[PDB]
Every structure is written in C-alpha cells, then in structure tokens.
Design a protein around this ligand. Sequence first.
Ligand code: CLA
Ligand SMILES: CC(=O)O[C@H]1CC(C)(C)C(=C=C/C(C)=C/C=C/C(C)=C/C=C/C=C(C)/C=C/C=C(\C)C(=O)C[C@@]23O[C@]2(C)C[C@@H](O)CC3(C)C)[C@](C)(O)C1
Ligand code: KC2
Ligand SMILES: CC1=C(C#C/C(C)=C/C=C/C(C)=C/C=C/C=C(C)/C=C/C=C(C)/C=C/[C@@]23O[C@]2(C)C[C@@H](O)CC3(C)C)C(C)(C)C[C@H](O)C1
Ligand SMILES: CCCCCCCCCCCCO[C@H]1O[C@H](CO)[C@@H](O[C@H]2O[C@H](CO)[C@@H](O)[C@H](O)[C@H]2O)[C@H](O)[C@H]1O
Lengths: 157, 210, 171, 167, 91
Amino acid sequence: GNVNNMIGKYSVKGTVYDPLNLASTYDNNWLREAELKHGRLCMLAFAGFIANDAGWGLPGLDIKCSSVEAHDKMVESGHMWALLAFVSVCEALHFSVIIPKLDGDWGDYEPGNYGLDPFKLDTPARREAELKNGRACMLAFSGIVTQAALGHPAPYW
Amino acid sequence: AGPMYDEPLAPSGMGREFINKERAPLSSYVGASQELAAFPGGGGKEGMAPTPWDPFCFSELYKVSANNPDVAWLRESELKHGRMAMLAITGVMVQSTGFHLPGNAEVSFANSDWVSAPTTLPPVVWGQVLAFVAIAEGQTSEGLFDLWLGDTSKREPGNLGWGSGLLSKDKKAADKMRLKELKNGRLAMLAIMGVAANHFIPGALPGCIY
Amino acid sequence: AKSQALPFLEKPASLDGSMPGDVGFDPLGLSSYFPLDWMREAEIKHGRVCMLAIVGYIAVDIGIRAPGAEKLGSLTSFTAHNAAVTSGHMWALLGVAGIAEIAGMAGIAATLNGSGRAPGDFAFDGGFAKDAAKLERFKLSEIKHCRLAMMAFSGLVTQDAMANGMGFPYF
Amino acid sequence: KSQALPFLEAPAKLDGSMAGDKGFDPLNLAGSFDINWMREAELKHGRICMLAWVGYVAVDNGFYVPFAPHVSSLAAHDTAVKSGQMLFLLGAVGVVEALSYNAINEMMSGQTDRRPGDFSMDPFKMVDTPEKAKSMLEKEISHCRLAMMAFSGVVTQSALTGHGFPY
Amino acid sequence: LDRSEAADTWWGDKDYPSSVVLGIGKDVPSSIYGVTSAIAFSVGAYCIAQSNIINILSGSTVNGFYVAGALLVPYSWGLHVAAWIQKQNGK
Ligand code: CLA
Ligand SMILES: CC(=O)O[C@H]1CC(C)(C)C(=C=C/C(C)=C/C=C/C(C)=C/C=C/C=C(C)/C=C/C=C(\C)C(=O)C[C@@]23O[C@]2(C)C[C@@H](O)CC3(C)C)[C@](C)(O)C1
Ligand code: KC2
Ligand SMILES: CC1=C(C#C/C(C)=C/C=C/C(C)=C/C=C/C=C(C)/C=C/C=C(C)/C=C/[C@@]23O[C@]2(C)C[C@@H](O)CC3(C)C)C(C)(C)C[C@H](O)C1
Ligand SMILES: CCCCCCCCCCCCO[C@H]1O[C@H](CO)[C@@H](O[C@H]2O[C@H](CO)[C@@H](O)[C@H](O)[C@H]2O)[C@H](O)[C@H]1O
C-alpha cells in the first residue's frame, strides 16, 4: 500500500509524519499492521499495569504483587505460560494470514481488519481514535514502565 | 552431445541420455547476496547481488563428470545444513541460559554443557530424537538421486512440502523469503561451527559467551 | 473461499464439506499433508475411546464394580490402571483391543484402497441405517460428541490428577 | 462381500472354491502368499490338535498302553522322552513329513492335481464323489478349527492350574 | 536347475525392479512389508541389546530366544528393501 492514502495522518494540520522517510523503506501495509498491533497491545499493557497496581485481582489468583515485579512471580507460578499459549495461538493465526503477504499483494485483507466486529461498531472516526489512542498508549506505557522500574509508586511520579 | 564435456560412462539406453540432458543454471537460484556486492559502483538491491558467488565454481563441476553433484543437490544440501544449523544454534543459545524442561526421577534435563548435554540423558530420551530424525531424513528424501544427476522435476530443492503454502504468491516476495531463509541459514551455520571451534580450541571466536 | 470457523483465514483445500462436522478448521493444514480419511478415522477412534473412558471413569469412581473386580481392593478410577496391569486383567483388555484392531486395520486399509467404506463405518449399527439422512444426522452428532468427549476426558483426568485421589465432582 | 467382516469385501482368492470359506482374511495373508500352502498348514495344525486333544483327554481319563508310565498328560511328554518312545514317534512322523515335502512341492509346482492336506486316505471312499467331498471337507475344516482352539484352551488350562480331563 | 528354467528379472533399463525378484513375496503389499520391517528391526535390536549390551553375554547362560530375533535385523533390511520395491511397483 501507500502511506499517503492511509488513515492516521496529523489531525489538525493534515500532513504525513514521516520525517525520516521510512515509509518507502518497508511495505506500508506492514507498517500499518504493526502500528495497530503495537498500539493495541500497549493499551492492554497500560490498563493492565494500572489495574494490577490498583489491586483489582483476578478470579483465582491469590498472588498479590506489584506490576513492576509481577512478571517473575507469575512466570514462576505458571499463569504466564497459559497466557503465552493463548497469545501464541492467536499470533500463529496472524502469522498464517499476514506473512504470506509481506512484500506482495495483500488482497482484500485491510491491515488490522480482523473482523472482530460483532456489535457493528466500525466507523472511520473510531479507526482514527484507535490509532491515536494506540500511539498515546505506546508513549504512556513506555513512561509508566520506566518510571515504575525506577521505584516510583503507583501514580508513577 | 550435452552440457558435459564428456559423455557419461553410464551406457546408452540405461541412463546416458538422462544424465547428459540440459540442466538449470546457478543464476536461476535464489542465493545472491548484496553484501558481497556491497561496494561503490557495481552492486545489487533488495538483499540480492546481480550475480551469484562461486569462486571455486563447484556449481558447474558437473560438466567434467557426473560424479560431481548438480546445483539442485547442492541447494538441497545447503538448505538442509542451514535449517539444521538454525535449530542447533537456537538450541544451544536457549540451553546455555539454564532453561530446561521439568524432568522427573527418571530424566534430568538440567545440563548447560551443550557438548555433553545429550550424554546426560537416558538412552531412551535421545534415542527417540535420533530415531525421529532417522525416519524423517529418509522418508522425506525421495528423488534425491534424481537431484544429483540433475532432474529437478519430481523434487524441488528444499521443498519438503512443510508449510510451503505460506509462501507468497508474488514471485518477488517468494524469492525474498527464500533469500531470507538462505541468509539466516548460512549465518546460523557459521555461528554454530564457530561456537564448536571455540569450544574445541579456545579463542577461535573472540565474541563467544559459551 | 474462507473458513467458516476462521473467516479471516483462507479455507483449507482438502476440507470441502464432504465429511460430517466440517467447518474448515485447520490452521496448520495437516489434512493437506496426510490423508483426510486417516485423519477422520483417527478422530472417530479418539472420540469413541474418550467417550467410553469418561463413562467408565465416572462409573468406577461412583462405585459401580464389575463382577469379581471388587477383589482388586479399594480401587478408585484414579489408581485402577496400575492395579489392573499388575493383576493381569488389563493384558486381557489389550488382547481384546488387538482383536478389534485387526478389523480396524482391515477397515482403514479398505477405505484407503478404495472399498468405499466410510471412516468409522464398521457395519456394527443397531439397525439405524434404514435412512441415509438419519445416518448422516447421526454421524454429525457422533462427531460432535467425539469432539466434546476428547476435551471432556482431558479435563476430567487432569482435574483428577491435580486433586490426587478424588471422587465424582472434581468441583 | 466378506461374511465374517461385513464392513468390507473378501479378497480375490477367497472364492468359495475352498472349504470353510467365510470370507475371513483381514490381513490379506492368503492374497500375499499362495493359499494352498495356507490350507495345507491349517489342515495339518487342525489334525495335530484334534489328535492331541483326544490323546490328552484319554491319558487324563486313564488310557495307557501296556508297559507305560502311569503319569498325567502334562508330564507325559517328559516321561516319554526319558523312556525314548518320543524319538521313535519322531522318526515315524518324519517319514510322512518328508513325503509331505515332496507332496507340497508337487502341489505347488502343479506336477500333480493334489489337494492341500490330501494324502489319499479314503479306505471307505467317503468322498469319492464331488458333493460328498465338499460336505466332508467343510465338516473337517470346521472340526480342525474348533479342535485347534479347544486344544489351545485345554493344554493351557492344564499348564496353568489343576489337572484332569475337565481342565 | 537348467538355464531355461529362469524368469527374466533383468531391469537395467527400468527405474525399479519387477516384483518377480521378490520370489514368494512378490504379492506381499508394501504396507505389510514396511510395518513388518519396522517390527522386525525393533525386535532384533531389542534382542541383541538384551543379549550383549544390557546383560553382558555369559557363556554359562545365554537365552537363545535373543540369539533368534537377532537374525531379524538382516530380515528387516530385506523387508524394507522389498517395501520400497513394492511401493515403486505399485503393488
Ligand atoms: C548344535 C550346535 C551347538 C552346540 C551344541 C552349542 C553349544 C554351546 N554354545 Mg553355541 N553356538 C553354535 C552352535 C552350538 N553351540 C553356533 C552355530 C553359534 C553361532 C556361531 C554358536 C555361538 C556361541 C557362542 C558365541 C557361545 C556359545 C556358547 C554355547 C554354550 C551354551 C549355549 C546355550 O546355552 O544355548 C542354548 C540355546 C538353545 C537351546 C537354542 C538355540 C537356537 C538357535 C538360536 C537357533 C537358530 C540358529 C541360527 C539360524 C544359526 C546361525 C547362527 C546365528 C545365531 C548367527 C554351549 C557349550 C557359549 C559358551 O560356550 O561360552 C563359553 C557362548 O558364549 N555358542
Ligand atoms: C508444520 C506446518 O504445517 O507448518 C510450519 C512448518 C514450517 C514451514 C517449518 C514453519 C517454519 C519455520 C521455522 C520453524 C523457522 C525457525 C527459524 C529459526 C529458529 C531460526 C533461527 C536462526 C538463528 C540464527 C540465524 C542464529 C544466528 C546466530 C548468531 C549470528 C550468533 O553469533 C550467535 C552467538 O552465539 C554466538 C555464536 C556468539 C556469542 O557471542 C553470542 C551470540 C548470540 C552473538 C512454520 C511457520 O512453523 C509452519
Ligand atoms: C470388563 C469388565 C468385566 C466384565 C464385563 C465382566 C463380566 C463377567 C461375566 C459376565 C457377565 C461373568 C460371568 C464374570 C465372572 C467373573 N469375573 Mg468378570 N467381568 C469384568 C471384569 C472383571 C475383573 C476386573 C475381574 C473379574 C473377575 C471375575 C470372576 C472371578 C474369578 C475368580 O477370582 O475366581 C468371575 C467368576 C475377577 C477375576 O477373575 O479375578 C481373578 C476380577 O478381578 N471380572 N465376569
Ligand atoms: C469447538 C467445537 C466443539 C467444542 C467444544 C468444547 C465444549 C470445548 C471446550 C474446551 C475447553 C473448556 C478447553 C479448556 C482448556 C483448558 C486448558 C488448556 C487449561 C490449562 C491450564 C493450565 C496451564 C493451568 C496451570 C496451573 O494450574 C496449574 C497446573 C497449577 C498452578 O501452577 C497454577 C496454574 C494456573 C499455572 C463442539 C461443539 C463439541 C463440536 C464442534 O464441531 C467444534
Ligand atoms: C514457535 C515459532 C514457530 C512458528 C509458530 C507459528 C506457526 C504458524 C504456522 C501456521 C500453519 C502454516 O501452514 C498452513 O497455513 C495456512 C492455513 O490456512 C495455509 O495457507 C493458506 O492460508 C494462508 C492465510 O490465509 C494464505 O496466505 C495461504 O496462501 C493459503 O495457502 C497453508 O497452506 C498451511 O500450510
């Protein structure tokens, strides 16, 4: 694809933000798919960091730990292995669907259109909101992890 | 009466015309590397050089005799070594971190010495691995004598049929993925043999950690 | 076109709705690799084994004992395997299983060679082959029950293993 | 279609031509190798098992020869070996078995129209005509199979537990 | 045996030999050949291992049923060659 025809340009000024001209280096559809996946994974990570530090808990875990050290405790316990199995199944399906179309025709598969729209909530404004929230979440989660890892409590400051 | 300078010693009506027919060239194989042709002036693009690398001309040694293998066989062996070396280098890298399977009273998978890692296991545990490799390498190999003499018809070099459907339909992208395979395989071959050489004689690989 | 269970994923080539219970569910594409008749025969065999296994497990956990099997002792379903193999009755079970499996080899070889025998058709029906549509519906129900029962026995035996010697509920 | 296994058809070689043909060959052994050798082997096994069963039963229900050791049929083999009569019977059966080497060779090569398991023993012309031959051959092969299974059960029960004619 | 009493078994032109070379086993299916080959090789390896390796072979006590079965390894070799021959013959 071509980045100039995609959704997600600068909102108020309307210009494409590619100062380093990296759009031409790689397949633009792959860039869109990776951007959406990174943004979505980071929204989930941001919400999970905040929820774990809040202490919501999960049906069935007794372990109560801070999110900065929850990784080691949960991989020792074994929950992270089940989560990795689930993610591996889903991302192996995504492997099978996208990697056969890396540097070739992508067909009818729009980047990020998995078809999980049972409630019929699709809108171009909502796609733009998805991209902007994903970018904000990428930056916010970067900040939240590097602030918590330095020992700053839950508000993160 | 063929590409070879000499008629094959195999007789007429029992193989001679089968060996002495036209064979595909090295240029029609996805192995060119831009890194070798990475200098001012002449050079390639998309990770591939305009021409393949063969200083010793082992690819076209068939013209002297049919004792020597064909480029189809050489590509089959290259991809086999690359795949095996990729699995091997990944295995040693993962094992050296200390990560190991749970184990029980009978089996203990706790050993960081990759050289002596198989020796610690019981006879059955590595026996199953060797038996699986023996059966598969031997069942998947049908028509390899045909790739030696050159008949890339029944068997394509490196196409075992495992996950071949995930290759892209576009020729350019399929060749790109095949070239990525070849490059990673060659890098893994160099890496695993370098680690082995470093183990046998220290200092062979100065950047070693194993 | 696209898989019914995985519309985002392209449909498998081998699966085409011919077999009962076909939804086009095969991300790994092992049907394209190895024959589909063998796969469906294995699926039905696994389902039959597991769905008998569930009934046997729950029965012998509840306390239903075979005639003369009470002599083995205070045996739950969890620990009955070891005692049975030591006592030697499980060897007789292996013998009977091999007797049935000889006909199993004959059937699978026949349907692979081209006899036309359906996968799992052992001609042991209880007079329910009067109508082809009824047979097709029963085959679909059988395969659905097989798919349910493999997972059901998986969960049952793990839960029992996690709880060690435990009775019927496992809750 | 095979009658024993009604979910598949019988092989090409099981065609009724032979006695006791129920269309039972799940492994295609008789399609893999000559069926005359199979039938001759089946007959030989069955005759040996018939005679073995009746001899075991009689020796357990007291039936011994003059100048014989009064012993159960389980240890009769060892005691007869020690006496030496076992080797005399071995030679007696070996003569017939070498003649059976010749007979099997002629049967398989087609030099003679010999039926498997046939040594031309018909004092009373019990099967001089085709229909009598079919009937009596079906009845024998049935007795062969039944006595084979029966003697396997008997000897084993005897070697496992107990003794006597019942077991 | 006379020179005339011999089937034409030469197969230099062909890619695979005819099933006549198997003799009595010419009609044996390839699947049966292969599975019997696997069983024979496993049993023979087990017998040799239990005769010589797992128990060091003592002259006073040798089982005999392990000496038998050790011959099945050559038999397994022949059986898998015949399996390949029948597979290429389509028989
Ligand atoms: C009839 C001939 C004969 C006799 C009387 C003996 C007697 C003896 N041998 Mg044996 N031996 C023989 C033939 C014979 N051997 C042959 C042909 C070989 C193969 C080369 C050997 C190889 C051998 C070894 C290596 C050793 C003995 C030893 C012994 C002693 C104990 C064996 C035992 O208990 O076996 C009991 C076994 C049985 C009752 C059943 C045997 C049935 C066989 C396996 C049938 C098949 C034979 C086969 C086809 C022939 C070819 C050989 C093949 C295995 C390669 C004893 C003094 C041991 C000894 O004295 O050590 C100090 C010892 O270490 N023998
Ligand atoms: C089943 C079915 O139907 O489909 C399946 C089947 C099919 C087709 C097989 C599939 C696939 C593909 C697979 C499985 C691909 C796997 C690829 C893999 C696993 C590739 C490893 C590469 C490793 C390299 C290059 C290592 C370099 C190593 C280098 C450069 C080093 O120097 C290492 C190093 O230690 C030294 C030497 C020195 C030290 O100082 C330390 C370091 C670290 C620097 C799919 C997608 O699953 C689909
Ligand atoms: C698969 C399940 C199953 C079935 C369907 C089944 C059916 C029948 C029928 C027909 C309806 C009869 C008539 C019958 C009779 C006897 N069964 Mg039996 N039985 C099954 C399982 C077991 C087990 C596990 C044992 C066993 C035994 C005995 C004994 C004791 C003999 C003794 O001890 O003298 C006798 C008399 C025990 C045994 O033999 O132990 C040595 C023993 O442990 N059965 N059994
Ligand atoms: C789809 C379909 C059908 C179906 C179906 C059905 C009903 C399917 C049901 C599936 C279902 C219900 C599947 C459960 C899996 C559970 C797993 C893998 C649990 C892992 C559990 C793990 C890894 C747990 C690990 C630990 O607890 C351990 C061991 C101890 C501690 O360390 C703690 C942790 C947590 C680390 C039809 C309708 C029948 C037919 C149709 O045609 C097709
Ligand atoms: C652990 C790290 C290793 C990698 C783990 C993940 C492995 C994932 C592999 C998925 C299985 C790949 O193999 C299987 O993929 C697809 C399943 O419909 C099939 O491929 C089919 O679907 C793809 C996606 O719709 C299309 O792009 C292909 O053109 C089409 O042929 C392949 O023909 C089949 O071979």
